[PDB]
Every structure is written in C-alpha cells, then in structure tokens.
Structure 1
Amino acid sequence: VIEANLSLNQNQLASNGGYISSQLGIRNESCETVKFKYWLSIKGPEGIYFPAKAVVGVDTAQQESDALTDGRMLNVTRGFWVPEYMADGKYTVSLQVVAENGKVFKANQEFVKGVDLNSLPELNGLTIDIKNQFGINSVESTGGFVPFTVDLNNGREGEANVEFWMTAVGPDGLIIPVNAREKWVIASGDTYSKVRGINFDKSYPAGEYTINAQVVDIVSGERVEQSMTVVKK
C-alpha cells in the first residue's frame, strides 16, 4: 500500500498564466519494499493534457521506477509554467503512481487560470452550477445510480440563449449519453433547474467515468465544460 500526497504552492493564476511549484509526497506504508513508477500530469479545459516535465532540448528520457523500504518515503519538488495561450478555466494536477503489482494511486489538486477559484463557472452573466448531488464517487460492479443537479442562472440584464448536454466518457472508448442536447431561452433573472441521473447498468465496464457537462451560449459561441468523476468497481 502506498500513500501519495500532492500540494501546490499556488492555486490561482491570472489570464497570462504563471509558475506553479508542486510538493510531491510518496510514502510506503507497508513492511515489504515496494517497486513503482510515478509522474505528474495536468488536465485542463478544451481537451488540454500535458506532462509537468519540460525540456530545453529533445526529450529522450524513459520512465524509471523507484523503490521504498519499510515505512520509507520519497519527497520531490516539481514546477511548471502555465503559458498565456492556454484556456482560462479549471485545471487538475495529478500525481500518479503505479505499483509493480498494478495498483494505481493518485493525488490531485486544482488550480484556476483567469477565473475566481471560489466562483461558479460562468458565461458572462450566466452561472453554471452542476454537481454530483450526493457526492457519490463510485458504484458497485452490479450497478448503481448517480444523480446530478443542474442550475443555469441567468444574472444578465438580457435573455440567454443556451445549449446544454452531458455525456459519460469511460473505459473501452465509451461515450455514454447522460443528457441529450437541450436548448433554452432563459429570461433575465430566471433559472433552468433540473436533476439528472445516470444509471450505471451492471453491463457497463469497470473503471473510471468522466461525467462531462457542456453549456454553450449560442449567441456568443462561448462554451463551458464541467467534468466529474465516478468509478465503477
């Protein structure tokens, strides 16, 4: 058994990006020595994925393992630049460890670029509040149901013409529909409110599902994404 810990020196960048320093902690909490591989990666808006390592010449390194003995622990510091060209929005930093026996351990932290950390995602005046209703992060292999709350609040002076949908992006290349495409013309000060659930049928493959919601202002053409995780065991 391994314990992975991740800490970011800062969690909010202005629109022109900046530097983020990470404190990586990998602890072996067992009597036996453990062999493993680890790395640090970033997920972001608009399909951005990138490695935390950046090189001055040509990348030619391999992925090397590590070993920790009884109660022993690894501690490293790694930083990375988030450049201005990257989309404003929410990013997830992921410290990932795969032990020799196939066990996966992950420690994540979020940072934002160009938006307030403690504000709802937003399209001008239109706030987007989409949540895993009861904080259910996994379901049994024999199946389970997970409800999500959806609240699109139009804080604008004018009406908002929006499109909304959700999928579940999972194992084996699956993209399961969770919410069909809906269109709503929402008056100033009004709200689109709704609860939507997905039934994870017993037949669906085990692994990680990213419940991915999308909201578009079809007049401005701007799009906002909200991603949430559910594991089927």
Structure 2
Amino acid sequence: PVIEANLSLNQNQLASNGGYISSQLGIRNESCETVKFKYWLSIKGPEGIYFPAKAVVGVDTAQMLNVTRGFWVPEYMADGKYTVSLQVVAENGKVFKANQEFVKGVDLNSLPELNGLTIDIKNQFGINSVESTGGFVPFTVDLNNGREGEANVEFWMTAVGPDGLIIPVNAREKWVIASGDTYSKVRGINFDKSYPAGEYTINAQVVDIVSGERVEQSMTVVKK
C-alpha cells in the first residue's frame, strides 16, 4: 500500500561464461502520506553466493522512482539459478521485495538435473505463507533417472529460518535408482505455533554420490 516495488530484467538466460544483465527498478508510493525509505539490489545464487549490485540509498519521497542498474555475472560463478531482489525498507519498518530470476549455463524452463537425473521439487499447492498459530506445507519430490545407467543419489531437506534456525524437513536418504525409474514422494513440514515468525527457505539438496555433484532447490515460506 505505502510502497510498490517493481523489477524487470532485460535478459533471464546467460551462458556458462556469464555476462551482463540490466535491470529496471520501479518504486512507487501510492499512499496518501509522503514516505521515507532505503533501497538496494542484491543477488542470491547457487553454492551460497550472495552479492550486491546496487548499494543502500536513503530516499525521502517529499524532497514513483525509476532507475536502471546493471551488473556483470562472471564465468567463475556457478551455473544454475539466480534470484535478483529489489528490496525496500520503509521508515516504518515495512519490507517490500520485487524478485526476478535468471539462469547461468542451464536452460530456463528445464528441470534442474545431474547429468540426466532430473530434480523436480515443488511447493505442492503454492503455499507461500502460514499463520502464526501454525500451518503445514507439503512438497513433492520427483527424482527421474533418464540415464542409461543407475543413479546413486543422496537427498535431504532443511528449513533455514529466523534466529539461526535450520529445521530438518527430510533426513538424509540414499537411493540407487535404476535407469528409467523415478524416486517419488511427498514430504511436508508442520510449522508449529512455537516456531518464530519470519522467512523460511525450504532447502532441498540432491547429490550424485558417484560424480560428487550437488544441486539445490530453494523455496520460500513465510510464517506470519
């Protein structure tokens, strides 16, 4: 209501050598009162990458904003899925975020994979938040071995949340999956009443034991 943030990327797909993404940042204040805020632009990626694109700027809307900022994604950074985040904090403490994705070295609109073993992990019903009094979110997990041979995989899930919490969601499992078979399950987490308010990254990890390659899938759930 007091702030609306908009984010647009000119490109959503880079090759493995990386490249350049230009972003259009739009911030409007439709409310009746004038408004003070700080904003910035950051990126999150595979293998724990976080990096800034645009530094913290204070803005008094008395003294709609439109800016374009770009950044280089270099080749050394890991191939996979990245999230760009325009973040605004209003003086009153309200947080507004506009997010967009790009990929590096993999196809957008293709499942993440480990050389032919695809990882389809989803928030089953698109449930992005639960009440402070608690709620339960199931996730579907489908590991499809499209290889000619066996896949020897390990799989687990945690919920990385407020107050330094890392809540187990799926214990470590190992499966030898034959050519053409699919390991399939539904796994949910109950956000108990007692868990703290805030943002939880439901973080799934899948490893090929033989190649040693890991892919993560990360999904957000807010406890209100």
User: What TM-score, normalized to structure 1?
Assistant: 0.92
1:90-121: per-residue Cα shift (whole Å, max 9, x none)? 00000000000000000000000000001000
Q: Distance in 2 between matches of 1:146 and 1:42?
A: 26
Q: Contact (CA 8 Å) 1:208, 1:229: kept in 2 or not?
A: yes
Q: Distance in 1 between matches of 2:60 and 2:34?
A: 31
Q: Which runs of 4+ in 1 moved over 6 A?
A: 54-63
- Between the aligned residues of both structures, percent identity stands at 100
| Runs of 5+ consecutive residues of structure 1 not aligned to the other structure | 64-73
Q: Distance in 2 between matches of 1:31 and 1:100?
A: 15
Q: Contact (CA 8 Å) 2:37, 2:59: kept in 1 or not?
A: no
Number of aligned residue pairs = 223
1:62-116: per-residue Cα shift (whole Å, max 9, x none)? 99xxxxxxxxxx0000000000000000000000000000000000000000000
Report the CA distance between 1:59 and its aligned residue: 23
Q: Contact (CA 8 Å) 2:208, 2:214: kept in 1 or not?
A: yes
1:171-230: per-residue Cα shift (whole Å, max 9, x none)? 000000000000000000000000000000000000000000000000000000000000
Report the CA distance between 1:130 and its aligned residue: 0.1
| Runs of 5+ consecutive residues of structure 2 not aligned to the other structure | none
Alignment of 1:1-233 (within 5 A): 1-53=2-54, 74-233=65-224
Change (3 A) 1:89 1:159: same
Q: Contact (CA 8 Å) 2:36, 2:59: kept in 1 or not?
A: no
1:20-41: per-residue Cα shift (whole Å, max 9, x none)? 0000000001111000000000
Q: Contact (CA 8 Å) 1:41, 1:95: kept in 2 or not?
A: yes
Q: Contact (CA 8 Å) 1:54, 1:80: kept in 2 or not?
A: no
RMSD: 4.0
Q: Contact (CA 8 Å) 2:37, 2:58: kept in 1 or not?
A: no
Change (3 A) 1:23 1:57: closer
Q: Distance in 1 between matches of 2:48 and 2:217?
A: 12
Change (3 A) 1:123 1:59: farther
Report the CA distance between 1:61 and its aligned residue: 23
Change (3 A) 1:51 1:14: same
Q: Distance in 1 between matches of 2:128 and 2:26?
A: 24
Q: Contact (CA 8 Å) 2:151, 2:178: kept in 1 or not?
A: yes
Change (3 A) 1:193 1:28: same
Report the CA distance between 1:53 and its aligned residue: 3.6
Q: Contact (CA 8 Å) 1:141, 1:202: kept in 2 or not?
A: yes
Q: Distance in 1 between matches of 2:87 and 2:20?
A: 21
User: What TM-score, normalized to structure 2?
Assistant: 0.95
Change (3 A) 1:169 1:57: closer
Q: Distance in 2 between matches of 1:57 and 1:95?
A: 14
Q: Contact (CA 8 Å) 1:166, 1:180: kept in 2 or not?
A: yes
Q: Distance in 1 between matches of 2:142 and 2:166?
A: 23
